[PDB]
Design a protein around this ligand. Sequence first.
Ligand SMILES: *[C@@H]1O[C@H](CO)[C@@H](O[C@@H]2O[C@H](CO)[C@@H](O[C@@H]3O[C@H](CO)[C@@H](O)[C@H](O)[C@H]3NC(C)=O)[C@H](O)[C@H]2NC(C)=O)[C@H](O)[C@H]1NC(C)=O
Ligand SMILES: [Zn+2]
Lengths: 181, 138
Amino acid sequence: VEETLMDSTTATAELGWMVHPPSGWEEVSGYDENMNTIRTYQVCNVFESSQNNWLRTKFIRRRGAHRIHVEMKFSVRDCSSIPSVPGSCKETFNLYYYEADFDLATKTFPNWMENPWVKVDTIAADESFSQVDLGGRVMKINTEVRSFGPVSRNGFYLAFQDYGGCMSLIAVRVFYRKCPR
Amino acid sequence: VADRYAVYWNSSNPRFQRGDYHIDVCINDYLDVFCPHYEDSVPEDKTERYVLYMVNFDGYSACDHTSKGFKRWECNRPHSPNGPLKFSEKFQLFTPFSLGFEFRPGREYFYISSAIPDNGRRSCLKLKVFVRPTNSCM
Ligand SMILES: *[C@@H]1O[C@H](CO)[C@@H](O[C@@H]2O[C@H](CO)[C@@H](O[C@@H]3O[C@H](CO)[C@@H](O)[C@H](O)[C@H]3NC(C)=O)[C@H](O)[C@H]2NC(C)=O)[C@H](O)[C@H]1NC(C)=O
Ligand SMILES: [Zn+2]
């Protein structure tokens, strides 16, 4: 029933997603829950004030879906486990989407703000990491799933906004359900 | 250099032949390791392949990762598409991912490699990274 529209883990190359402020999100090599190598994104400008870092995915073809589901796997560092604690450090990030009939996204085109971008939600982690453990990684990657459904255009982009946290977007899986019944 | 330091990890590189290859960097600078790359017209015998390890000084000095290092990268694709296979390391203070790698100003870090087809594990190719103290970095 489930149909994947995009899955960052199957890239087997570079994601090449757009980063509005270059000094914010950046693409880096990472690991999957089942201990596998993939392409991930991270931000950690906890020493800089007024952070508003955006990350935009490639154009995602709709393929006959209206209700879109976004599965996000991520790690968020505990703000108290980072020495110089200003007070602006955060542990959440926002997810947005923008639909369009054509790619057309450039680097400026769709303004980088809540205005044109439609907010899906503020994503929080059930488990932030500080250190702990005494044998090896076993559980510290969060999984959050959200949905939205106006999507009527040929495709859409997804955007993630950070505002002063230290986090890593490990994977993003987008899918819809086209029930045979 | 600037902010990104390119390192061509092969035995023909004079920088490695002098055996004391090191780079002076500042927090948030990057290290880009370029694996040996050969066109398709090579019997893959003269083709160099390596496993790269991050080790401590003693491991660095002896060309031994055993009990003193972490396997870091694998230059196992001497025929990758878009140019040489490349691995990158950012000298960041805090990792946004569990037990990732963190670096500190004024400290030295080391990397060594062992040939895959194995030559002898003798005088390995190695690199020392000196992360400059805050006072030096602007
Ligand atoms: C073994 O190590 C050698 C020493 O590092 C490598 O030689 C370097 O190859 C680079 C190619 O990736 C050259 O860089 C640039 O390459 C582009 C190709 O797109 C050229 O146009 C540029 O002129 C060239 N130089 C720049 C930066 O403008 C390096 O110049 C070259 N270094 C030198 C002078 O030897 C070997 O490639 C590497 N070989 C193996 C076995 O993998
Ligand atoms: Zn030096």
